[PDB]
Design a protein around this ligand. Sequence first.
Ligand code: MGD
Ligand code: MGD
Ligand code: SF4
Ligand code: 6MO
Length: 791
Amino acid sequence: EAIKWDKAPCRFCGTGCGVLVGTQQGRVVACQGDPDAPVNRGLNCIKGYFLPKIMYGKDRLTQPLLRMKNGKYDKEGEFTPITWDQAFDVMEEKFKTALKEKGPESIGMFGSGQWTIWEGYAASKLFKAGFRSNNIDPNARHCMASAVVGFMRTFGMDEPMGCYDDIEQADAFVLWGANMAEMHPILWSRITNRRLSNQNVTVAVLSTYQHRSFELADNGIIFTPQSDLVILNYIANYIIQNNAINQDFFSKHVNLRKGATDIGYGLRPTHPLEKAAKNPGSDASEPMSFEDYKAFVAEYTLEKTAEMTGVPKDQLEQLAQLYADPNKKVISYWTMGFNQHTRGVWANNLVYNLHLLTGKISQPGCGPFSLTGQPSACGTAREVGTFAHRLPADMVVTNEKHRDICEKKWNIPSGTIPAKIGLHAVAQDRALKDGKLNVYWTMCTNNMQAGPNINEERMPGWRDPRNFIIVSDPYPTVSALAADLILPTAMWVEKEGAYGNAERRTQFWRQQVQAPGEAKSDLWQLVQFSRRFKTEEVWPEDLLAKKPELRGKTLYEVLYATPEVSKFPVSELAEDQLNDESRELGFYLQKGLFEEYAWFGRGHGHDLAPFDDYHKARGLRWPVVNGKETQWRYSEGNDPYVKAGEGYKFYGKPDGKAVIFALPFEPAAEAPDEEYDLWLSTGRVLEHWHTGSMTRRVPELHRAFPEAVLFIHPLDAKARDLRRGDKVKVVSRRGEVISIVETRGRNRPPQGLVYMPFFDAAQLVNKLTLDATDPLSKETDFKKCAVKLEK
Ligand SMILES: Nc1nc2c(c(=O)[nH]1)N[C@H]1C(S)=C(S)[C@@H](COP(=O)(O)OP(=O)(O)OC[C@H]3O[C@@H](n4cnc5c(=O)[nH]c(N)nc54)[C@H](O)[C@@H]3O)O[C@H]1N2
Ligand SMILES: Nc1nc2c(c(=O)[nH]1)N[C@H]1C(S)=C(S)[C@@H](COP(=O)(O)OP(=O)(O)OC[C@H]3O[C@@H](n4cnc5c(=O)[nH]c(N)nc54)[C@H](O)[C@@H]3O)O[C@H]1N2
Ligand code: SF4
Ligand SMILES: [Mo+6]
């Protein structure tokens, strides 16, 4: 009857604040900053604050709903309650018919950086090892794919080599389009402490519009969309021009390559920009001489930079001067500005160069730090490998040796994991539209609302009668309402969980409460489904002839209830500890999966701690080796994978050196023209998360920001007969929405640029956006398209 408090990471942004959750009488009634979490040390943003309301939204789903018409499934039918048994019958039949008629390629899953590590792992096994389809792709394809491809190109291993502790040791902070004041508030406040308490510290904030992070900027810069590539190249030039190359670091630790150019925009091949492409979608590169490079960036003159970006010459020099100064510990930060960008991989590589020329990396207070938006985009989506090309621990389906390790460990026949790359996020949109993808299960995502260009591909595809759409969600979203089967899902602290944040910190949480009705977690869903299939129904005969001891076995027995996954008995759980899945299946399912999964990366640079260690700690940052977590990767002393006297080893590349890539500016896919005269950028707002399905179900979050507005410059409204408060129609070549004029909000765009958040389900901004992606990462450029306003 006293409140019970236990740790969990925050359900929201990638900062990964530690939280103490208070339960009483089967409800979460209180939630506070965990004092002893090193991330936030008790601090909290308004979203973390309202965590106890997110589960008690008004219309939680409690029951599977199928579209039905006199007693049977119908695409045009009315959502009607059916049992779990019946929901799996229909799913069983749908998957089994697709496998029969077009095979594994006609079946797909759309997963999430909001999945629990084990949910991600289970899903991958189901799809890759069970059904033999790589058509599993996440959330995170809209988000971190560009930073990930960037890491792989520059370092050969994923994820940052610094940590949040760099904040209170930095001399200078450069945010490359990150609105950290709103999207990483706990980081911001820590930066704010650093800045405000120390006069020799500088803060540069570059953005496409003025926002709340400008408040703390010594060097506040507004540039033109895409022009960051110019600035990035310019600073590199400046460093050379000013003899600021750290020679010693440069000599032992860097290679130079030139990247392939004129790569298109990851649109349908029929599209003008694809036909016009020279090297469409190529990530190819060749070794490059130093003077080749020096000539390359010499094109990027202070004068040209100023023109191409609209930013004052002296401000560009103040900025490049921070990188060049040999005594300035610098942190570089970026988020979707760099990542949701048609040359975002290039962006990523381009910013690394800056750090790599100057030797500013893998040291306390000093490093390039790719921020992550989602709570477990890193720990789940990226580390487990819930992508179409992926296997655990940075491994690729494309590599026969990688396939071998996984097939051997999982104890499935040789050759069962498929070698062909599956369909990425936007490609799944395109395949659905085409009737090529006929069975499609979405989990822990709101893609009808979050994915780009709704009208053109996704809505017609989802609604196509050749297709069967399944969504698992705690709430009836835009996505759920567009589906054919809705599966009611356990959320956050209604299950045992694990999330991995932006600084490689893995954080566990015990189950504290129980889901309403018959809501089950994604882990239950996936694992109970696996029992509906026999090996002979998913694997070809001559795969079975390699291990005939698996004939007549279900994907359940084969992927989840193996002696290995089930080593761990329920007696290991505390007597009064909730764990619906494990208590049902009679073994500690989360740990067995975790311990089989951790195996891949242990001893290969990705080391996860013993399962049970995370249940004690307020998280651990990997590699965790002999009890000891890693704060800085790739530097001697800090990382146990660097030998004595090496100084720096980037052991992700065969030869241990990081790679600088010379890459040009290329223009955004769609810029303003005569008709569509304004830039449109999109993103978030402090008080809302993503599509708002959770935060809008919080009375007071809704009351702080009830509707999406359109942030517009006074004179752009003036010139259009639009006044603050006016109803306004925003129109692109792809669709339209009706919003409200805001000339005096927190975001003040320069003239010519309009900005709009996507949380509001009545104002679907992704009816406007262009599904052009970085052709290398396949990440959609949500930040940049052309638009017009009518009254
Ligand atoms: N309150 C809140 N916080 C969140 C979330 C949320 O929903 N709500 N979601 C989380 C997730 S998953 C994500 S991915 C993040 C996103 O976090 P951010 O990327 O920080 O925020 P957004 O609102 O998505 O991005 C708008 C920013 O894009 C920049 N931008 C636009 N065009 C360009 C360009 O050409 N170049 C560059 N360099 N920058 C550009 C603008 O400067 C602006 O700063 O937020 C995370 N945290
Ligand atoms: N225009 C535009 N579009 C964008 C972006 C942008 O800046 N501009 N940002 C992109 C980025 S960075 C991201 S990360 C994506 C995010 O896009 P999404 O991840 O699709 O959006 P969310 O609202 O996070 O979706 C999470 C869903 O899961 C439900 N849910 C909560 N807990 C659980 C659970 O345990 N299980 C299940 N099954 N469901 C659960 C919530 O109700 C919610 O419907 O959006 C991308 N789309
Ligand atoms: S900063 Fe992020 S992790 Fe911390 S409380 Fe806010 S939303 Fe949650
Ligand atoms: Mo994101």
